[PDB]
DNA sequence: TGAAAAATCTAAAGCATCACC
DNA sequence: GGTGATGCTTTAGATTTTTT
């Protein structure tokens, strides 16, 4: 970018800063502030030299706002050979005069240096510039030639490798100066020549309320297409400012005026309104823009406004004589986002998508409103509102302002404290934090922690294409072992029905021999309470001995089961803390030998294995050499259109790797008859326990901080309850603010702790190790598998999860105990026995003993300790657990179950109400109804009879006709809505069904539905064109409400029939495919699990699959089989030898 | 050192394709009196008895008793190469773990020796007791194979009954049931395709036709086969082969549990 | 009490082999005139009529008009079990839900009686009147099946012409196309190979070639076929089955309604 | 007006079914001396050279060197789809991109013509050289097909070695290793069971069995197959299409350059 | 931001059938 | 009457999209 344009760019953003309540601080004085935004701009200094800087925007507690510019000269580090640092530094100084300003040698601790523990540091060279474009220029000048030279293994060749080129500028400032969003500051100024100084203030923490805005768009459209920015008109913008609502309405489309109306969904929520009616759209946009000018906000909020609101309004401002930049300040960036120089843009969809932990298909609105806010906003589909806007505007206004208030309170209650709790520890702007994924958040935390430890940052690694494992066999997958997610058995397990069990007396003898030790460990480690002052220890030991013996003497019982959730909370961070794994600590034997700590009898090594899965071509290395040599004298089509001929040597790595992979794949798919080979081998690697602990130290710090903030959140929550029991406005406000702050910090720490494990496996990460994820996942698999071996011995497990076990235990097996304790602070102690049992199992199995830490760096003395935070926390006895079954042998449904709370509500329900893709709206209401009504019953037969009876409703309605009940809601009872993003033309290669019904509807009304994208795709499947697959029998409902002669003609033409005279909608539909769908659902949910648990068919209208039918015939028959082992007497045993 | 030679190479192909489907790993017992097989299937429902006496082979010699374990599926897979006529020679060594198969052309043009490396295994070997069987019937292999493949399509249970007029093959299932009665052929010129029965006590006892179909594919071994049964004992199906030896299969019955009343 | 017998029972096996895939459910009709079947196929696009008169069975007894409840894919499994020279002796008692057919070996040594349970259904019956048709071709059955398989390999539809020079079988697909001419043969008097065509006027009409090749599998039951075809009339694919009955096929023509006109 | 009538159609169907799964699409060069096919396969390691001379055709008429680009799958399914005993004929237009075929039955009963489109492609005709080969062997097609399917069925690579005693085919694998040796005979006056050896210089080289199976799929084309190899020159699996043309094959040596261990 | 559920193409393997010595 | 061989059927595996 030319300076002769960026100078007026910076002048323009300075003007816009001046006209939105911000002012650059010029008077030398100290004033408090609150950082809310960073923006890398340009600041001309006092000596007419171009200088890049940052723009720290602040607000204050009184309403006044300002900003401060910090000029910090950017830099990166380069590393050169020993004995040549000063020469290359002087050569760069005398080669880029005017670009390079200051260069010096700086010692910093490389993290992968050989023999680095005793104090070796590699001398680095840091060069500083004035502007960011000079960084880009010198980087593009020096990087590619030198990285090719290094990977191959004039005086610029003496350098080897540079670091943190990819770090953005504002992140670099936020690291070097410790300037995080949502903190109070004392900014002091002296003059232009004197650099400005900033200090952090911590004696107060109370967050102010920035001026906030939240608007939503409702628009009409031509029927059944995606709305465009030129055919229809905006008619109602509804926006919220600090709990007060304003609505601006275009009077051309709506019918009459609008009056003020209260809109409160619940007494907690406030919906006041002062509506305003305007003549035309230009006056609406002018009034809205001027009202934004009047309010002058720093933060504002849209719900999916990046892709639906702002491009639309920007296009219409551009067409109707304005330009969107110079009046508000929002514009399109190269990355397709909408940032403002003065305002921060929030998108609630990104938060729901990334951190809300909702099901994937419930990411859109009304779902985060019924799940998080607690109420269902008033809705109507976009097809109806176009016609609704003509006659009455009450429903349209209600929907628009309901969307506005839902967006506003969804942001303010949850998203705002959460994101402004992340930004206290993340060194990025709030929109930067909310925009991109958890990977860069964790990367920024490791960035700041590595900078406090003075550690160089590794480059984002090159994604090495076509890697060779041992004897060639180039890979298309480099993966660790998948998670062990299964469902051991299917059916119902309620806490009232009797259930079968199979004890092992040896297991109960083992459990009996050590009850005292398990209670020792439970009292000493779980609560850090010394055991020598509890009084009723003998009584509870006698009680548990009596229960265990009375259950032992009959190792076969049918009693009521107690469902437990033996899971380990924060399991993967617990593993990485206990085993002390760091992504640059695990080192193979090829370098530990060069390490001087390779002494026999030491504990620098810990061995853990993992299952590496590798999928590759069967072509050997020689085949790869032949194919790369043969791919040397051929032409390729140009990458750009109308380009010249492209040879092989000048091709980029990506395209040549793709083409060579395609050539190998085509050579393989005809020659070696096996395209892919998946090979799993055990790999064992050494994890150095003697490392500069910043990673695991960070994880430990976040876990301790999370527990501390949970404690402070609980104590401030009981302060909140006392405060609402006394009722004074100031103190309830203060305690509410502090409680929300502590809760948001708690959730932020929990999210970061959950994302540490997910970060390291991600491609391109600075600290990349697939061995990390493999080792931690395999250790978790080992813990889970020993847990399920023990639960198999003592009871029965039900579901297999990455960090949880579900199980049923006999009711006579002990559950929990109460202890009398002489401690005045902790007089009552409760311990659940299965938790203690699993805890002592993992204590004797998985405790690290080589867990070593620094003591003092001067004498190199290392204190060896032993820690194990792996804890099976348990959940209460649930009322029921449901495992629906699959339809095929060998494959069992993974993470598809339902758990019920004690009171009869829903505890968990996963894998069913996700609606990941478009569904039929024919199985969701069925499964919801059966789960709701499923609880009533006494035995297995009674509960299956009840669920069969409630399923007979849907089976009778779908299998028979609609009958007496009205036909109004039947169309939406079966209709499935589908949509596509691109045009109809570029999808013409495939057939599918969506473009097929798009073409079917194109021949009805016109070709205008082809030139656009995203239309209605109703799927009422027809019957009478039999033999044709469903892809051709897809007709929409647009022809049902059309003209009668037109629909007669098109029903005769489309479905290749002419003689038939019945054109009713109650005959066109194919009841057989609908019954097949509902029956497949009922096989998944009810009938197959009923047949698995030794119970006959609950409903006789559904036919079992062939495998289950033949299993039931061979089982129910009194003729099972006989063997030969007992029918003939065994002779003996001998084995074949050499 | 072990040497064997068959004047007719078709019988080795036929025994390998007969024992291909039932088991996967076998254990040849090689003796100077003959070679035998007592391997056991993975389902533990059927056992294979094999006898091939020494005097059938053109050349046969054994220095001592040898026990080697071969992958029988791959054994039949490699033997399917050899033609229906070529001379098959077996060569083994007491200091080697590789069994050799030399094939000889009828008109002395081609030789084809193959090397198969064996493996160790742990299998059960079960002693078979000898008892007199109540009902004995011989039957041509073709029509018994047709009967078995016929009744396989009805259901999964076959009932073997011996009445005064002859043997009766029942089979029930979801498709109803179906019966096959056979009579006594006395005024027949040749007993190779004929049937004859002898009785001690009538008995009804059921078998599963999956393993019986597995036994069915030994039909080309010889045109005749004898099956016999008694109270709570398996069948003995003797596919005796041209005085080289015989081959037998044992299939578990089940006692008639009470279901009628 | 109803029963029947057939000296050459392979024709029943062959017609069930033909009908096992076109029809899944059909209600048999048993009358004093003989056996006849009237039903609609699975896709409801073609209705088949079968007729074997009383003289086809050497021993026929039918005292009342009664109808079976046979499903075809079930007893097609148990009718294919016979040999090509067996004897079929069907039997059915009036109050029984299940009919039993007894098999007889060609040289009379064994009996194989199988009974198949029936579900009672009710399907509407329609009587297509006889009409004189414009064209009737005396095409050999083998050549008709060959040309159907030939044309079905290119495209999904075929048009049939009967010009004054012969009949024209042409099909056009997305990949290729072509036309086949069958010239009249009068130099050879044998009807097994020569063709004679009834000539009234040329007719162009499109049929579902996929379904035509679907039910061309009935070929070996008759030596020659006759295609009776009229304008906007379903074609009558006649098979003179053995020497006593006929196999009536009616496939409804399809008409394309293109949007160009 | 490219016309090529040949009184037999079986040989063209066989030589076209030879290129079923080997070359998906190729260029059909027409010249006054006949038709040629030079084409690289999808994996770009083997070669095909088919020549059908003009004099071998019954009647032949060409006017100008014209090259087509029809894919092998479409024309192969078209030609194999029709009959085999009939008479083939070619028909083409000067500027059109469509070939035509004529199937005239020898008994003057029916005619059958199909015509299909093509795709335009003008890949360079590789100027392969002809060199004197180290050894030449002539053996019947049947036993060569047998041993190739053998060694693809038992292993992956074959070492073909030629000496004075004949030729050997040593194949190894994860299951074992064996070889097949053939000896020349001269007392047999017919070549249907006789093999011949040309001995100039012995050579050992390793090939792949998938390509050998793909080539020797063309076994009904000729009763004899001739092989020739050198130190680094590929094989020549030459075929003799009656007395009308020849179809060759080439395989680059399987270099392995393995570590010496 | 992806990546795996489901549909759809696709080739290998077994089976009854076809003509000949 | 057996037997090499082939069209037909089945069945497991490769492929491909989207969720806006
Ligand atoms: S594992 Fe031991 S030898 Fe290897 S780097 Fe660590 S301390 Fe040094």
Numbering used by the authors:
A (entry chain A): 29 to 181, 213 to 1197
B (entry chain D), C (entry chain C), D (entry chain B): 1 to 261
Reproduce the article's own wording on this structure:
The high accuracy is achieved by their 3′-5′ exonuclease activity, which correct errors when they are made by the DNA polymerase (pol). The POLE1 NTD harbors both DNA polymerase and 3′-5′ proofreading exonuclease (Exo) activities and is therefore referred to as Polε-core in this study.
The second intermediate is in a Pol-backtracking state. Further, the thumb, along with the dsDNA region, has moved away from the P-domain to facilitate the T/P fraying. The larger space between the P-domain and the thumb allows a longitudinal movement of the T/P by 1 bp in the backtracking state. Importantly, Arg-975 appears to directly contribute to the T/P fraying by forming an H-bond with the template T-1 base, which enables the mismatched primer 3′-end to flip toward the exo site in the Pol-backtracking state. Overall, the thumb and the anchor loop drive the T/P transition from the locking to backtracking state.
